[PDB]
Ligand binder design. Sequence first.
Ligand SMILES: O=P(O)(O)O[C@H]1[C@H](OP(=O)(O)O)[C@@H](OP(=O)(O)O)[C@H](OP(=O)(O)O)[C@@H](OP(=O)(O)O)[C@H]1OP(=O)(O)O
Ligand SMILES: O=P(O)(O)O[C@H]1[C@H](OP(=O)(O)O)[C@@H](OP(=O)(O)O)[C@H](OP(=O)(O)O)[C@@H](OP(=O)(O)O)[C@H]1OP(=O)(O)O
Lengths: 220, 220, 220, 220, 220, 220
Amino acid sequence: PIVQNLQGQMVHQAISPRTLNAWVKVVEEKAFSPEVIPMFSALSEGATPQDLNTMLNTVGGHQAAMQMLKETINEEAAEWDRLHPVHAGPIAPGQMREPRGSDIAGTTSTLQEQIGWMTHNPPIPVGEIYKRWIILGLNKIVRMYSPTSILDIRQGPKEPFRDYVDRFYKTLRAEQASQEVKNWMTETLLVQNANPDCKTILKALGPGATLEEMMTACQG
Amino acid sequence: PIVQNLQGQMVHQAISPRTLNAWVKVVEEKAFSPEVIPMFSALSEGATPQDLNTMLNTVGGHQAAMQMLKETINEEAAEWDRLHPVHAGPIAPGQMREPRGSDIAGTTSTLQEQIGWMTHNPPIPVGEIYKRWIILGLNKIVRMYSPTSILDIRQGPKEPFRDYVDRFYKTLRAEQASQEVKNWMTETLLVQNANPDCKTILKALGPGATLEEMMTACQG
Amino acid sequence: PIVQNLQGQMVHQAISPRTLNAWVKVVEEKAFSPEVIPMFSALSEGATPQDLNTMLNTVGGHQAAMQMLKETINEEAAEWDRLHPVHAGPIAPGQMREPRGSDIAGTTSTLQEQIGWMTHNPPIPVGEIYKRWIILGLNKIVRMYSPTSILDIRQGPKEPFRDYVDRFYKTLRAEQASQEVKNWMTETLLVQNANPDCKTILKALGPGATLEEMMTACQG
Amino acid sequence: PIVQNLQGQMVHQAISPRTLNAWVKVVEEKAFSPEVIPMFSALSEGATPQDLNTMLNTVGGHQAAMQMLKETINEEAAEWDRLHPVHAGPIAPGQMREPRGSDIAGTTSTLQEQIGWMTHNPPIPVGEIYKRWIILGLNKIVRMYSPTSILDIRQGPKEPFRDYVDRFYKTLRAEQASQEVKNWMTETLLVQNANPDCKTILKALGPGATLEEMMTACQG
Amino acid sequence: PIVQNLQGQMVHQAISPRTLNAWVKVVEEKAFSPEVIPMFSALSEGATPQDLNTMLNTVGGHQAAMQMLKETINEEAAEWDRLHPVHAGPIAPGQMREPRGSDIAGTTSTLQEQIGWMTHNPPIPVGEIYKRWIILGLNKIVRMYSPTSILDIRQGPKEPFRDYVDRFYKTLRAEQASQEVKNWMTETLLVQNANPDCKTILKALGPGATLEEMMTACQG
Amino acid sequence: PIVQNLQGQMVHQAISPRTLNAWVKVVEEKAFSPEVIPMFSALSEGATPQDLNTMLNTVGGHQAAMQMLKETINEEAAEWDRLHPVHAGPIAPGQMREPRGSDIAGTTSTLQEQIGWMTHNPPIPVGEIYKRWIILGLNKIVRMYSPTSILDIRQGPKEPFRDYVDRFYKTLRAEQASQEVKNWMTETLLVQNANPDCKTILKALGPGATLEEMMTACQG
Ligand SMILES: O=P(O)(O)O[C@H]1[C@H](OP(=O)(O)O)[C@@H](OP(=O)(O)O)[C@H](OP(=O)(O)O)[C@@H](OP(=O)(O)O)[C@H]1OP(=O)(O)O
Ligand SMILES: O=P(O)(O)O[C@H]1[C@H](OP(=O)(O)O)[C@@H](OP(=O)(O)O)[C@H](OP(=O)(O)O)[C@@H](OP(=O)(O)O)[C@H]1OP(=O)(O)O
């Protein structure tokens, strides 16, 4: 992608084969865990919209997610076009006007236009907008691909509380609810669906008990 | 290949063995899916025609498709020679003669000649044209190695709609239809080739809903 | 992370895929053993808080420890906010106010703010404070994942004392005890919970001898 | 090999061990397939005959082919010596006479001699000629390695035409006959030795066609 | 860490994860053999005391050896403090006093102090002192881990003398003694504790021959 | 090691960890074979003697060969001391006297002396000489693990001729002798020790037999 230059501006460079190999490995090993969402921001720093398009295309299978993200990109491009004032008239030499939905998506914009937009004055980070749209698409796709809800988790009589609370927090992270709702569910459902023995132990522990005390109490 | 040197001008470089090894391993481990076409453009950027020829030559097996690509290269070179009259003029330093059909593919041109063509003023990315030429072939190559039709696709009574839409979009990517034709064909056949209960539910929902409602309407 | 340009000004770079891939693979493979605590500081030196929280988020599984460390980070940030004399009123131009309880976590502080803090006059090592908080959280996590206590280790009648003292010192490294108590216990517990013949040999050898004499006298 | 300087003068570069290790491991792991013939050039660009000799000597297994290629190199060096007699006379400063029969084989010469030959104007392509001789030796080796002829191939009744055409083209590539007769026979023998259904479809198509049409007609 | 730059002054850097991963894996997999002592010196070139401490602490298990080497480091630091003059009072600005016994290990001295000491004129090779202390600790732990002495090695009645001489030399390399003692042992003990037939053949061949002649004398 | 600077002066470098890792892996995995003899030289294309002995001491096991090569190094140092008289008197400033028998091995000379000798005018390839000394030693190392002679090889009736000729050439290449004896034996032993059918075929073929025709006539 675009790499920094020693005491210089930002110039475009070829995509590292290591980056794409790591991306295909991580999207072929699990491809449906929340931690792959930060991984995206660990590799899409400063990348051109063309790089985003190539990364989206290089994935194998699961084209339903590709259609989902394409639809979200189209609708958000339309909303950006309607909200942002239209640009016309003589364009200043050396720079280009604010790109429309087609240009930011990379379908009609070449590499030179994206490079000029990155080095604009003031710089226009439409790559950031495109990747935040992709982040929203990833959020909705991980909502889609989550195979369980939050309220249906139940701890088995022989099931340890360790992996129980682990999967509870995994589904909590998969949930898109507000912070206060997350706090309420983590304060209630963590005991509403546990084993009865240490359920009553935690009830005896009183309200607002930290989870370390609960985990040291549910043992045995 | 030719890479943009930091705080300096671009210079020719030898092909890294790792890129070729990754290319050959991904060719031998994966079928002729559409997503391999962008992957090629993720490794052939800033490459001389000789580099592209070497990349083509490292193919392991499936030489029938290689013969198809060679024939398409020959016919495209013939078309290029036919549409470009022979450029006759003085030969002086700083000016290089017009490459022919055997020269764009790099079969009869040395690496130094390609470097001189790249450094010629004005720059001639004719080798890049050759790249797109092979891309064209790769397109039909996919259509050759995914012989399953798109009209005959039908979701079985026990076939989940997730895999149904996955294979439908795989064959769509294998298809040569334009963007609008693809959109129309999907918006028709997705509801035309579903389970009867899904058909009734989605027709009760009505047209205009995105694929999200299509998925969430007839779950199970 | 943060690097110094050769004969140049300070420049902030991204995270290389090598470091994150190695960290995630070693975390997913190796358990929550004490040796992972130094390993983190091997790869998280001079890193911005945003890089630290992205590295934290890229982990997969064991979300109970993640929730516990988030709680500890939040409470420590609140304590830092209340104890520190939070400046109020106007801020002079060209300055940067003290980090917030959420700015140190990186969830509300932009990368430009982090860069300004790093190069501030005088510099603010907020990233180091966050790293120390992470170190405390990892100590809590390794205490949580401690298999057994330290007083229950018993030497087998025929098991060699070599692996006995090895696991004793491993558990000492995994122990939550302070400095003076561990100094007291490293001179009396090992000679008290060994085979009787070697115990009496060590007792006759005299107190104050280092562990090399202990192991040589205990040789069979 | 010998690499160009960053806007400077030609400087010899050290041999990368990774390329040699990859070459030897792939040669010893997969096969003695003719696919090594082109990719060898990708690993021997701008390399002195010493580097080629070092690469050749580090091979493992099947020393009979090594003896064959050594004998071919010796006889071709003798041919070069007898066709082009050894030059005599004092060597003017700044130039150097052509390499001898042993010098061109990279045996009785040092790296500095190759550097002086390369910097000499015109540059004598001793390395290129040695590479051509190695290519001819490998062509003879792969001619030997062929376990069957080209005219005895027959297609099984219970086999798809894809494997038949694949093996026909791989054996055609493995052939060392003249290109003219090869291209003449690749349009006839493929149907002269095909299954009856392909034969009937092709003779219904009529004499003369492109292999794309042939292989699409064989489908179904 | 301390690594030279291309035609430029040395700048601070960080140890690559692959180096530490290889170091820890070879430490945990091969042995606590003397050959690891040079290996460490291969990976400790231009390394700050912080890097040395991190590389030391990244090992998993064998904590008894870690405690032993820490104790030897502490006693060596005490010896250095008592031997080298104890500076009292600050020095003129621009210079710093010699690092304390706790500063060589890096327990109390930060990386900035180590960098300042390294760049100070005259240079402070405190890292070299720490490395040689680690070398002494490795030598003593190798001597500890030797399962047998050099005096009680007996050749098997049917075991070939190749394995006998190999194990004799391997044990000798683990011996911490002068080179003259090693020469005397290799010249005397190699025949004293051998099989009667090789003993008689060795005595017939005389004591003036080298190891090669005597090992080729009584083969079988 | 010895690395050329970009159009600059000669600058010393430390040994790359990957080079020594590859060396030790190929030594431990692949048995002692002549093919690894070039593998050493490619890994030692310019290095100080200190680096040579450092990479030589990394190998674990087979210490008998290490002792043999150390003895040969000592005897070659004695030879160098005898043939090259020791010189005394004044030493020119900026230059160092020629290395002695102990200095070439690097046992007494420090890294600074090696650097000064590398940059000496005229250059002193003392380390190069050292490497050729090692070559001599490894020659007799080839004689160590040779299990049979060059005339006891026999082709079994059930064993294919390919394996027989492969082993014959392995033993021929491994064996150290003159060129004339190899030329004599490459036409006598192989025919004499072949299965009777193709042996009499070769005898009917007569003189001038080449291995290619030899074992293409032996097919069947
Ligand atoms: O291509 P990069 O991502 O910049 O990584 C390179 C690459 O190593 P890898 O292919 O293993 O990643 C270099 O190898 P070449 O491409 O030159 O063959 C290597 O050079 P050496 O092989 O000589 O060590 C260099 O290391 P360095 O920068 O120390 O010269 C290393 O860079 P990193 O070590 O920063 O990944
Ligand atoms: O550490 P791993 O996860 O096993 O990956 C390694 C590593 O490659 P990366 O540095 O890209 O991770 C090796 O490089 P080093 O760490 O030894 O420098 C490389 O070896 P080469 O550099 O010689 O290519 C090797 O490849 P191989 O297993 O073919 O030897 C490759 O393994 P993977 O290819 O399985 O990732």
